[PDB]
Amino acid sequence: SEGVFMFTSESVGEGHPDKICDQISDAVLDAHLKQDPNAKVACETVCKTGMVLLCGEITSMAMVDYQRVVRDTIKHIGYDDSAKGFDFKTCNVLVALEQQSPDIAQCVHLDRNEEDVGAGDQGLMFGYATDETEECMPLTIILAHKLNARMADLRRSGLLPWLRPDSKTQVTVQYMQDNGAVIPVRIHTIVISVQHNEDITLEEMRRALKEQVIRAVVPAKYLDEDTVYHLQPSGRFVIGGPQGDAGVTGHKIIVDTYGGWGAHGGGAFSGKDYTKVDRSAAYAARWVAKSLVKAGLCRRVLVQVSYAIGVAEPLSISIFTYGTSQKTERELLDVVHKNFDLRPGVIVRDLDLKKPIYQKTACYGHFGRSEFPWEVPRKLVF
Amino acid sequence: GVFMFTSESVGEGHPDKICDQISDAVLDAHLKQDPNAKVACETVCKTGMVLLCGEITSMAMVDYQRVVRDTIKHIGYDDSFDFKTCNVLVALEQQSEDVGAGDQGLMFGYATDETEECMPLTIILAHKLNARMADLRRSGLLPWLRPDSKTQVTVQYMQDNGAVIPVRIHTIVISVQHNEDITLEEMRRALKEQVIRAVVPAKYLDEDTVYHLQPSGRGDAGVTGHKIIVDTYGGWGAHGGGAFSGKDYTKVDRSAAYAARWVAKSLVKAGLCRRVLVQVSYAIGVAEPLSISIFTYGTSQKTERELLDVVHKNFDLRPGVIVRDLDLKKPIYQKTACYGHFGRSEFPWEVPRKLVF
């Protein structure tokens, strides 16, 4: 075990402006899929000072109360009393969504069996896994997610009632190399900025942050006397969320995925239905990456897949195992070709992607949570 | 070892890139009058409507309508998108050396000695394909071309002790918007001869290369910060989440990422390595970086731990020093908003620092 190195990931809570827009975008997606499971949705949410704008394209036989969808999401996030900084009742909802609803045609809509239909766009997608945690994800991002989930739970239970939904966490971890695999040694640095009420002091918060959040989240084996704790380091932070800075769907794509580990091909997931390869292939690529680690073929893998618009079969598939694989990456390509079919139409069938389960992906990461079908690994015939 | 790798790129007329260009055009307009103007301008576009949203703090007075419409005109949209009939909703809120970072975040710098500009060939070719089509459109040599294009280049590599060397072109994809008065076969032939042959070196091309040209068979919502991989390295290296366009130099998502590239390119150009990934991270209100990490893919002679000492002695990566070194108060950001932020020697972060090692 030769070289020590540091690595940092960040994460944000449900009340961060960008993540509000991700959650609303997928809440809109779920609303359509509950009524029309083949609804084509591309819904970009922007938010600023008690205003929400929905923008993009929809083609659905559903009828959605966008005002209610938006306002429920914001209420659920925690901006339900104005005492928490904002009101979900006073929120402006401008809907600028180009809408169609399928017109009964003499021609059939799909001329193909849906599994053989060509990819809706081009693009690059990445799947990554690492056997350092049980959920096959980097500890840096998993801890950054769990810190936000911890604060959310303590907020909703009233145990720290001064908490407001807008939070941001960053965890730097100290690693050791092990023939291309990576093993967590200690916690280098932790940062937590979080929105608060007026009736609490910085010292109360910082102490409450260390004891009731960090100690509950991070295993004590990883925590040290030399760990740095930058807690509420910006100073005061009362006004945030919708009332704060401008939020947009697709500005937290690294937080959504792997926190710097592996790679990314550009695609924002939230707002987009399952016929968009930016989402479906990326979910499938994770599925492949996690399956290869869970089978014991490797300890750490980065998978790339690419498409062309109108072509069903992937253009290229690449495997990078950081030398932790026993077999060659070329050999492992054969294993993936024989155990998986990565055409978009087969990807939806395998992963059950017509279900309205997307709002839950819009915070705390799209990967690492076994509740989603792409996190349950496939047993491989190798 | 052999392996494949794919990068994509989009043209000036792609909805997302329109919004990136407008966002930085707005940034430049402010910096021409107030060089310390704080700008965070998110542009959304759909069907002849443009919405600007976010925060500004500037003593400049900007004709946002003119800034937006000139940008769209310059991209190539004269008539149906149209710059003359274009709605401009402006919803931008106004407020009011060892300074702390304006936010937290992760940033990555990456370089590779496969091309002269120290970038992956996959992304560089994908960029040049779009730049080629733009030039042929504006000169009238292919007047059927319209500004919205998308290119994807898959390249076949060979490993060389952690460095990567391009062997051949596996696949090329080009989708591009067009006029009604031209046939698919004319376009596809014109795509291969006048674009691809002019862009890609013939040594890399062979008769077993796949050409998916206009494969969709002859406008959607655009947003700033939806082309961040196209903006950077095309899948190679890594990304920390930050969208560059619309944000001024006091935002670390942009300034640190530009500085991290500068470090990454300097280490390759000095001959300390052939390929490197650098990570830097910050905390809000702290000037000095929290962590700095070096990953050389085993192409480095020195240890990555040793190379950390080289970077510590040759660079100061506090945001306030980063702006001074890289001259980031200049209005040069609209040019970064298409064709990649990295690989172009015209920008100060692409000129490498000679290292005392």
Swiss-Prot record, chain A:
Modified-residue entries (S-nitrosocysteine), positions: 107
Expressing tissues? Expressed in liver.
For the ligand (K(+)), the binding residues are 44
Q: Its pathway?
A: Amino-acid biosynthesis; S-adenosyl-L-methionine biosynthesis; S-adenosyl-L-methionine from L-methionine: step 1/1
Ranges for the region named Flexible loop are 100-112
Q: Binding positions for Mg(2+)?
A: 10
**Quaternary organization:** Homotetramer (MAT-I); dimer of dimers. Homodimer (MAT-III).
EC no. given is 2.5.1.6
Q: Which Pfam families match?
A: S-AdoMet_synt_C, S-AdoMet_synt_M, S-AdoMet_synt_N
Origin organism lineage: Eukaryota, Metazoa, Chordata, Craniata, Vertebrata
Q: Which residues bind ATP?
A: 16, 166-168, 234-237, 245, 251-252, 268, 272, 276
In terms of superkingdom, the source organism counts as Eukaryota
- This one is known as S-adenosylmethionine synthase isoform type-1
GO biological process assignments:
methionine catabolic process; one-carbon metabolic process; protein homotetramerization; S-adenosylmethionine biosynthetic process
Sum up the protein's function in the record's words: Catalyzes the formation of S-adenosylmethionine from methionine and ATP. The reaction comprises two steps that are both catalyzed by the same enzyme: formation of S-adenosylmethionine (AdoMet) and triphosphate, and subsequent hydrolysis of the triphosphate.
One of the record's GO cellular component terms: cytosol
Its UniProt entry gives the catalysed reaction(s) as: L-methionine + ATP + H2O = S-adenosyl-L-methionine + phosphate + diphosphate
- Here the disulfide bonds are 21-47
Cofactors demanded by this protein: Mg(2+); K(+)
Q: Give the matching PROSITE patterns.
A: ADOMET_SYNTHASE_1, ADOMET_SYNTHASE_2
Positions binding L-methionine in this chain are: 57, 100, 245, 276
Disease note:
Methionine adenosyltransferase deficiency: An inborn error of metabolism resulting in isolated hypermethioninemia. Most patients have no clinical abnormalities, although some neurologic symptoms may be present in rare cases with severe loss of methionine adenosyltransferase activity.
Q: What is the effect of changing residue 331 to A?
A: In MATD; diminishes but do not completely abolishes enzyme activity; 12% of the level of the wild-type enzyme
Per UniProt, the cofactor note for this protein states:
Binds 2 magnesium ions per subunit. The magnesium ions interact primarily with the substrate.
| Gene this chain is encoded by | MAT1A
The UniProt entry's sequence similarity note says: Belongs to the AdoMet synthase family.
Species this chain originates from: Homo sapiens
